[PDB]
Design a protein around this nucleic acid. Structure first.
Lengths: 61, 142, 105, 111
RNA sequence: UCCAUGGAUCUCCGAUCGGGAAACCGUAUCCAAGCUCCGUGGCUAGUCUGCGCUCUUUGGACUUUGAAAACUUAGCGAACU
RNA sequence: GAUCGCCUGCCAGUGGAAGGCUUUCUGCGUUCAGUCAAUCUACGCAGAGUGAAUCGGUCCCUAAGGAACCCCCGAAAGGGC
């Protein structure tokens, strides 16, 4: 059912979004200034701990 | 909590079926219909067609019947009305007549456990605690 | 606290659809949850699988909602993303059941 | 040779059920203690391992359902996910301790 | 599996920081006293000897808002008949 | 596939706003709809499909206006500024 509105079905003057993307100024002359400061950056590690395979064993003891 | 007093496999005797008078091991226990399937008991002939699986014709397979229509045998071979409890902590909880206590058939495993693999992590990689903490702290993060 | 949002466990269930029914490809197609930015998917597919992506674009469809009156049953909210690699990559025809079971028809 | 070069490859590996066998035995998911008694680094590396696995598995699922509408592979995702749960849990658990500025930023860098 | 206890996570509107076209879009201070961190001054370099910052967290005080059926007690107060 | 036609400055063309909200496409099918016998589809099932520093929104401003505060007024609501 066409429940609550959502920009896919609206007039061109509608904006909902998906709730978490705050990455800059919001420019005066209709732009966007994405700082370097507020950007997700990841401490992802290298070639992982290799003896740890994807799931533990069933081989009976 | 003990909603059931008839377990998988244990010898049982029939009551009231179209085949009154028979003893069998319960192959399956449907807890939903409050019913059980017993070996060679409650035969019935299905018609089936199935293309791939060669489901091909009349199958004489065993269909269930209500638990209030089976009663289990004893070393007197009949009525136990086995309700029982001997809560002494020297076992024999189940199956007291109305005398003889049997603690299940001890089947233990319905499905076999695999004894190998490659994609699988070698057994816990031999559980070794991997220095989670030993010197009241080491292995912690940075 | 060097960089504000300093993540440690990323959990964006990227799901690639398929190469463009191809074998050596310049760009391809993910379908993630509807909250994956461009900056995110850039900095994560660079930093976890070791891609090298140039243009990150994301058309944002919705799910296939089937109803029979008041009975409505819907699905997720894809965020189909297109990603552009700097030098094409390759795919071996035998990686899996997939991409020969598929390429049959 | 189970060596997936070509980062595209990561989203799959290991042609299943080769000429004659069922290498369809795929083990058991991790457990509470088994996870308890590990280090932080190898923890999060097990984590990203589960990540790549969840990825490959979801990709398998939707690819198969879409193209051939079959998906013969049985589910492995609940074990993968709930094991991620247990990792997160043992982390949040060994989190709490006496020093504030240490326990905070610990829970924080976790959550 | 499952029960009981107790713990972990715990998206949004209703709504209550600001906006709002409900379920979406924008965002702490002041002050003490804490290691780390980052230059500053010391020229007297003597724990080589000392100042002043920050992001943060504690621990406070600033920083602040709640709903129901009937019942009750009041304020108003009608026509049909 | 081919002869034959009708439209070509508001019934028949081109890009589209308002509106619709999968009706687009791909395979399968014809129980329902089609003013038929329908293999066909705007129909049922199944699957895919919409990439944008520059387009259009977002955003900055204000008009018509709706309210906020304070203020004024009113039995209550609330009205006025």
């Amino acid at each position: 059912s066409l429940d609550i509105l959502s920009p896919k079905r609206a007039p061109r003057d509608f904006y909902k979004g998906k709730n978490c993307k705050p990455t800059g100024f919001h420019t005066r002359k209709g732009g966007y200034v994405v700082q370097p400061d507020k950007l997700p950056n990841y401490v992802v590690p290298d070639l992982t701990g290799f003896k740890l395979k994807p799931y533990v064993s069933q081989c009976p003891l | 909590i003990r909603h059931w007093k008839i377990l998988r496999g244990d010898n049982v005797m029939i009551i009231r079926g179209k085949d009154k008078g028979e003893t069998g091991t319960i192959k399956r226990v449907i807890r939903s219909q409050n019913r059980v399937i017993v070996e060679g008991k409650n035969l019935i002939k299905k018609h089936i067609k199935g293309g791939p699986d060669h489901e091909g014709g009349i199958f004489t397979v065993e269909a269930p019947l209500h638990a209030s229509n089976v009663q289990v045998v004893d070393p007197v071979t009949g009525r136990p009305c086995k309700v029982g409890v001997k809560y002494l902590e020297d076992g024999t909880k189940v199956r007291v007549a109305r005398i003889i206590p049997r603690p299940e058939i001890l089947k233990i495993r319905a499905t076999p456990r695999p004894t190998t693999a490659g994609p699988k992590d070698t057994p816990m990689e031999f559980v070794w605690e991997q220095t989670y903490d030993a010197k009241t702290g080491k292995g912690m993060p940075d | 606290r060097l960089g504000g949002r300093v993540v440690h466990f990323a959990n964006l269930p990227i799901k690639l659809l398929m190469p463009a029914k191809l074998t050596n490809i310049h760009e391809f197609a993910l379908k993630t949850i509807p909250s994956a930015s461009k900056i995110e998917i850039k900095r994560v597919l660079e930093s976890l699988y070791g891609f090298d992506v140039e243009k990150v674009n994301t058309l944002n469809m919705d799910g296939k909602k089937k109803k029979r009156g008041g009975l409505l049953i819907a699905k997720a909210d894809y965020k189909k993303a297109y990603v552009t690699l700097r030098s094409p990559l390759s795919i071996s025809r035998d990686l899996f059941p997939v991409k020969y079971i598929e390429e049959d028809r | 040779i189970r060596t997936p070069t070509n980062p595209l490859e990561e989203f799959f590996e290991f042609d299943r059920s080769q000429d004659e066998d069922k290498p369809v035995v795929y083990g058991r998911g991790w457990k509470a203690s088994e996870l308890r008694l590990k280090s932080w680094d190898d923890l999060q590396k097990l984590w990203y391992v589960l990540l790549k696995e969840k990825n490959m598995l979801m990709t398998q699922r939707q690819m198969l359902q879409a193209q051939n509408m079959q998906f013969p592979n049985p589910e492995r995702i609940p074990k993968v996910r709930r094991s991620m749960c247990r990792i997160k849990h043992v982390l949040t658990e060994r989190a709490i301790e006496e020093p504030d500025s240490r326990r905070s930023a610990e829970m924080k860098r976790m959550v």
